[PDB]
């Protein structure tokens, strides 16, 4: 018995998964006997891509390290998840100025609410696939005392989901605050749900406006948002607290994740450069009503789904509607993108309303 | 920062794993940064006790070598588990002469079925908890080709989880011989369903009395079973299959884990010493109604159950009874304590068929 590559390679027979058209035996073979300096193997990261037969990535970093031990692996799998994304090919450096937005005030008619969404890794630290119980409490340290350190309309508490009260997890249900242990395959089969749900949490402001998850899916989840359709100011939020946690973490030697090619670095490849979710809630009566309503928002570069999540109703015909991409985009750029898309999803919206044809506004 | 005990000690608040109760911090520093040959460290072995915040063990060996590295711990909960069975204890060599049985042919108007399972471990292999795609590999092959030179009343068919038919399918579950993904806790958190269905199978004699499992819970489930009260023949074929089947592996220069102390490994200690879980399906119409079913069934050192599995409704009174303990007794001697346990079950039974008070027997 060889406990090698050739007794190791997965079977990826029936699998749909991204990994498994990109790792012949031969990569394998390469990868096969590397760890990164926190131990992370090939065997880890592609770990999900075995277990899933359907269509994943499957691929996922063990720690930050991960992206150049198994660079080639990370890199075939970046570039088709990101539709064009090779190895010579950068994220643009972070903008996260929102003086330098155009129009990012909805009519609030159609638009409900606004958020933005990303997520942060702290540097030194594994992620939540191969991070210890030991790790993990340092993550949650960093950010909760880089936390308490905010002021003015960042001030906030932290909730433990270790020390919650039933009181304290029934008001974040109703903030829709609240983070579950997660079952998804991608966080189970990674062993990033162990330990659950030591060293999790969730922080926020007293406004309710920023939004704070540690050690659910990324070290840091980092949410701002408001009713109404002030996208702009949801972003001069984000890009003001996310530049403050930071400032507060350098007091304590630490820093987000983050190099000059992949940008933001975090666990799932899917979530690279910016990790950015910029979403509206908006209400399209008749547009949703209309044959090329899917056309028209898979040629904004925009995703939809329900109010609730995935797999729910566009209630009342609101739609949450986010950038779809992640990478070759800066977080400014993604906010005007959704900022332009959701403009024009109204335009449709109100040409409808008055009884005309959208056939001149619709994408080309 | 530091990576040391102290940032990782578990926090077993609210929790009832019998591991939390015994796992001092002192304990898990001692035993912090030791691994096993096979890389098996103690936060792995001691992860379900973790993730599970329930009454259960917590415990799990990633390898064989687990019980010698985190020995303290694992002795501990052994003690406990096993009720009473200490560093010093020994559990006794192993018996599988089915020769030696008394009265090992029940009444079948109240034994409908009898089954023998153990698990062995096929030592060199780690355990499901951290058995690389490979290790699990080789674990099947070796397993395979020894089965496959089995004969005899042993004659049999291997189905591989990965290449098995729609058709192949049905038949096993029209047998109670499919198994699928473990879903329980112990086996999800210890990360012991890894890759599945690969490497997994499942093998059984023509006659079908004869079931082995690979890769499932343990490297190898075995189970011998037979339709009426021929506990005896059950456990003759229940230890000649272990036995050639180990002598097989022999031409793998492979051996089942075992040991003086803790006689066959798995990596549940829950399943020491013998693993061995003997039953019968058997019925007792009245003895179900008697106010004390359960306190006897406990007084026999036997464990009662519906034909369901776990707690399911026992139809037409037939239970599942099997003896409630692995360790401290031989194979023989548990297959000898569940006929002796049985038979006094029956004699209960008969007793109040002819309406005859029983508490002088209970």
Redesign the interface.
């Known amino acids: 018995?060889?406990?090698?590559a050739?007794?190791?390679?997965?079977?990826y027979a029936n699998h749909g998964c991204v990994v498994g058209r990109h790792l012949n035996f031969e990569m394998y073979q390469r990868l096969f006997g590397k760890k990164t300096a926190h131990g992370v193997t090939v065997?880890k990261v592609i770990?999900p891509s075995?277990?899933n037969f359907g269509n994943c990535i499957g691929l996922i970093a063990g720690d930050e390290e991960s992206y150049e031990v198994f660079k080639e692996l990370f890199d075939a799998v970046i570039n088709e998840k990101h539709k064009g994304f090779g190895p010579n090919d950068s994220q643009p450096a972070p903008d996260l100025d929102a003086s330098k937005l155009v129009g990012g005030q909805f009519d609030e008619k159609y638009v409900k609410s606004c958020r933005i969404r990303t997520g942060r890794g702290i540097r030194?630290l594994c992620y939540p696939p191969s991070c210890?119980?030991?790790?993990r409490?340092?993550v949650e340290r960093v950010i909760t005392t880089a936390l308490a350190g905010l002021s003015g309309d960042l001030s906030g508490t932290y909730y433990p989901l270790?020390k919650m009260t039933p009181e304290q997890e029934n008001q974040l249900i109703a903030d829709h605050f609240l983070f579950q242990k997660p079952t998804g395959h991608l966080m189970?089969?990674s062993?990033s749900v162990?330990?659950?749900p030591?060293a999790r949490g969730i922080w926020h402001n007293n406004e309710k406006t920023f939004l704070i998850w540690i050690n659910e899916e990324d070290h840091m989840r980092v949410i701002s948002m408001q009713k109404g359709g002030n996208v702009k100011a949801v972003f001069e939020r984000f890009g003001r607290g996310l530049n403050a946690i930071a400032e507060q973490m350098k007091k304590n030697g630490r820093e987000y994740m983050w190099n000059q090619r992949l940008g933001y670095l975090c666990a799932c490849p899917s979530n690279l450069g910016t990790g950015l979710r910029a979403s509206v809630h908006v209400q399209l009566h008749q547009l949703s009503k209309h044959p090329k309503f899917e056309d028209i928002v898979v040629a904004l570069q925009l995703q939809k789904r329900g109010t609730g999540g995935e797999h729910t109703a566009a209630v009342d015909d609101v739609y949450d509607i986010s950038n779809a991409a992640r990478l070759k985009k800066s977080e400014r750029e993604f906010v005007q993108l959704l900022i332009d898309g959701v403009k024009k999803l109204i335009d449709m919206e109100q040409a409808l309303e008055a009884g005309k044809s959208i056939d001149d506004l619709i994408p080309a």
């Open positions: 018995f060889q406990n090698d050739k007794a190791n390679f997965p079977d065997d770990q075995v277990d030194g210890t119980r030991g790790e409490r340092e270790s189970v089969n062993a162990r330990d659950w030591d």
